[PDB]
Structures are given as structure tokens and as C-alpha cells.
Write a protein that binds this ligand. Structure first.
Ligand SMILES: *CC(=O)[C@H](CC(=O)O)NS(=O)(=O)c1cccc(CSSCCNC(=O)c2ccc(S(C)(=O)=O)s2)c1
Ligand SMILES: *CC(=O)[C@H](CC(=O)O)NS(=O)(=O)c1cccc(CSSCCNC(=O)c2ccc(S(C)(=O)=O)s2)c1
Lengths: 238, 238
């Protein structure tokens, strides 16, 4: 039992929150290209056998509400849980159309003590959003009851390092989401999740570089950030 | 080339900063047991063929200094770099004997742009320290400049989740370090680093629970936190 039981009747839900248009009141640009991201995740997770539910342009409130309701579902027959957040953001924050939401609030609904039908099951959060304004210019090449931690079995696949900008191309989508999808399509049938995510790290880090008319944003790099509290290996098959 | 080149003439340095006694002026307890931690890491890393250098009770200044100097070495002939910080801490902070140091300051010396002999080489930071005061009560069971990001090829193996306390036993050491060492001893010859670190996560999360005379700190759990910006697989052999 080094790997998670992934032979339940259902793989699980894959909730995609796709925020494209924001309230002018926030002073935030449209996320051109995010639809391509959404469509790619949908098809990719569909082939993995996940029940996909897309949600477009949700308010901070709608996001909290969506997450609460989903955490209140009976996941007993589901192997895992995937949530993908596509939006603007800051460190520890994701933006609804009308304002920011703490990631901690979203993930808390899924704590091992608050979502009992998911206790002991992998809970994946995939987040394409900025975590700050830093830019990366790159470099040329005894005692033994039987409790488990409530923050355990979480995996947070971040599109970028803490404090840094996250890059999104207007026609093809975010660097991170395109690479994740591609790596999943190529390797989900043979590789452990962590290893697949390392391939993504590499692809994003080597194959992408920003091009901008504005010197300040031109020739920048990006590295994704895998944050794992998983206690087992994850394979998308059996 | 899915895995890091680990056949250089030397595996690399393994710096262990072991802070046990702090200045009264800080109002911080001695870290009873940390010596067991230090001794175990030394032995474990020695078997892995790492050049181990232990440093006891360093000041915030002495730490900055140690790191500067080590980043200024010629690591051309080294496959990797390991740094282990054993001390009190807070989110993003590690304490010297006389005060706190920002982790970012420590790791920045090793950025791909500031330590050219480690560019493209895995830089591991293993950290036994608190990240806050939260407690875990648990639950019963086109376009192609060939740059890479400067923040890439880093791995931060945190003893605990963000915001949380990290547990250390007076006679046997920290829960995290004892488990890391054991897992390295058992699996370093066959398993990829990430997978080993996942075993650690499991061991800590299942086999450990606090026991305290004070209800506030009794029966608590802990989950470690793997943070990976690696672009390749890491094996401690070849
Ligand atoms: C910052 C965010 O929250 C947002 C995340 C998201 O997916 O929307 N990041 S962003 O893509 O909007 C972003 C990226 C870099 C800088 C900024 C500040 S506004 S400056 C806009 C620069 N223009 C570009 O986005 C690009 C230039 C070249 C690009 S390419 C073809 O190399 O991908 S993209 C906001
Ligand atoms: C706060 C820290 O950064 C420090 C990190 C370190 O390695 O020193 N963590 S700590 O172990 O000092 C720590 C952990 C929880 C709470 C506190 C503040 S009050 S300490 C309460 C008394 N200690 C204990 O209850 C135990 C110590 C080991 C225990 S066990 C279950 O392993 O036998 S219980 C500080």
C-alpha cells in the first residue's frame, strides 16, 4: 500500500473555476487565453475518467459557496478530488470576479476533519495565478489513537514559485496549464504524479520565455512549484 | 536525461546548521534532542557520499556569513548541494542563536544566477523549524537565449505545513529528521528523492502523536511539506 487506492467506482470530481472577466471596479484585465486552458483541462481530465464540472467567472462569494457545497457532497465512492483555479492572484490569494479569496479558505473545506468522505484520499489543487510581482530573469545555459493529520493528503500544484508572477499567453493559454495537460496526456498512463509534475517543471522552465515590447516584462522565465503533503504515490490508473 | 547528472567526482556539500542554545535575550528554550538530529544526518549523509560540515549554535550573522562563503565556493566538481537547518523558526524564518534570519536570504545565495557552479544542479534545503503556532488535532481513522529560471532546481523539504508548529522529541530528536534519516537509509539506493520524501510524509503522519501534560499540546499531529522546483528526478546513486 505505497500507492493510493484508485479503484473506487469513480476517479472523482474535477472542479474548474475559470475566471476570465473581472469587475471594472477591481481594476483587473481580462484573462485572454484562459478559455483554452479550461478546455484543455476538461478534455485532459475527461480522459483520466474524472467527472468534470466547469464554472466560469465566479465571484469571491460564488467560489466560497461552490467549494462549501462540493465539500458537503458524499465522496465515499470517489477515489480523489481535483480543483483547478484559473484566475489572477497574489501570495496565498485567488481572485473572484469581484475580489480576492484566501486559498486557505478554499482548501479548508477539504481538511481531513471537515470532509470525512475524502479523509485518506488525495486532494489536488491546481492553481494558475500570480503569487506576487517578482520577475525571474533567468540565467544562460517508545510509544505507538490512530489519527492522521488534517492537513495531510493535500497536493498543491502551483504554476509558479512563491512571490513571483505567473505567465499566460493570449492565444495558447498559461505556460503551466499547457504543459500540465501535455505531460498528463503523455504520461498519466505510466508515471507517478510527482514525477509527471517534475516533467512539467522542466517543460515550463526550458521551453518558455516571455516576449514583450516592454523591456520590464521581456525575456522572463518561470518555474512551477509542487507542494506535496501526500502520504502515498498517485497513479491515474490501476 | 530525465534525472540529474549524479556522477560528478563528488556528490556535494552537506551543511548542517545545528542551533541548540539561544541567547537569553531572545526568550527561547534550548532545543533538547537536536544533537541526535545532527548526528543522524551526519551519518546518513556520509553514507550517501556527501562532504558533511556541521556547524553548532550560529548567530544570525554567522549563518548569513556561512552561506555567503559556501555559495562562493567552486562547486564545479560537485553533483549537488544539501543544507540542513535545525533551529526554532516562524513562517519563512529560521532563528540564529541571537535572532531570526529570512530563509529567502539564505537560499538566494544559491540562485541559478548567483552561484554559477551549481546552475542546473539540485539544491536541497532540509528545514526542521516551526512555521507558526497552528496545531493539528488530526482525525481518527512558435517561439523557442536558452535560459532557465534562477529559482529553479531548488527543493525545500519542510518539516511541517505552512503556519504550523513542528515537533521535536527530547531524547530521539525531531519527528521529521528521524523519519527522513530512516527513509534515506532504507530507500536511498532504489527510490527517487520525491518518493522517498513521500514515505517520510507518511511515517511522520501515522507513527507520531504528541504526548503532553498540558492539554493544549497533547495528542497533536504533524505533516511535513515537500516544496519542489526541481526539473529532474534525483537519485542518490548511479
Ligand atoms: C499576475 C496574474 O495574476 C496573472 C495570472 C493569470 O493567469 O492571469 N498573470 S498575467 O499573465 O496577467 C501577468 C504576467 C506578467 C506580468 C503581469 C503584470 S501586467 S504586464 C503584462 C505583460 N504581457 C504579457 O502577459 C505577456 C508578454 C509576453 C507574453 S508571452 C507571448 O511570452 O507569453 S505574455 C501580468
Ligand atoms: C517552535 C519551533 O520552531 C520548534 C522547532 C524545534 O525543532 O525546536 N518546535 S518545538 O518542538 O520546540 C515546539 C513544538 C510545539 C510547541 C512549542 C511551544 S511550547 S512546547 C510544549 C512542550 N513540548 C511538548 O509537548 C513535546 C515535545 C516533544 C513531544 S513528543 C510527542 O515528541 O514526545 S511533546 C514548541
Amino acid at each position: 500500500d505505497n500507492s493510493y487506492k484508485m479503484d473506487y467506482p469513480e476517479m472523482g470530481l474535477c472542479i474548474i473555476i475559470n475566471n476570465k472577466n473581472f469587475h471594472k471596479s477591481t481594476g483587473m484585465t481580462s484573462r485572454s487565453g484562459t478559455d483554452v486552458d479550461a478546455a484543455n483541462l476538461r478534455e485532459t481530465f475527461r480522459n483520466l475518467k474524472y467527472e468534470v464540472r466547469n464554472k466560469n467567472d465566479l465571484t469571491r462569494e460564488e467560489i466560497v459557496e461552490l467549494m462549501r457545497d462540493v465539500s458537503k457532497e458524499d465522496h465515499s465512492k470517489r477515489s480523489s478530488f481535483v480543483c483547478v483555479l484559473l484566475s489572477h492572484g497574489e501570495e496565498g490569494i485567488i481572485f473572484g470576479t469581484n475580489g480576492p479569496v484566501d486559498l486557505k479558505k478554499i482548501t479548508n473545506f477539504f481538511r481531513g476533519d471537515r470532509c470525512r468522505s475524502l479523509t485518506g484520499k488525495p486532494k489536488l489543487f491546481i492553481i494558475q495565478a500570480c503569487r506576487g510581482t517578482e520577475l525571474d530573469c533567468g540565467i544562460e545555459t517508545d510509544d505507538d489513537c490512530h489519527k492522521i493529520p488534517v492537513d495531510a493528503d493535500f497536493l498543491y500544484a502551483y504554476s509558479t514559485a512563491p512571490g513571483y508572477y505567473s505567465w499566460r499567453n493570449s492565444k495558447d493559454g498559461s505556460w503551466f496549464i499547457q504543459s500540465l495537460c501535455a505531460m498528463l496526456k503523455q504520461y498519466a498512463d505510466k508515471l507517478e504524479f510527482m514525477h509527471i509534475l517534475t516533467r512539467v517543471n522542466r517543460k515550463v522552465a526550458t521551453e518558455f520565455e516571455s516576449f514583450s515590447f516592454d523591456a520590464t516584462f521581456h525575456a522572463k522565465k518561470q518555474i512551477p512549484c509542487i507542494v506535496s503533503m501526500l502520504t502515498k504515490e498517485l497513479y491515474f490508473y490501476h
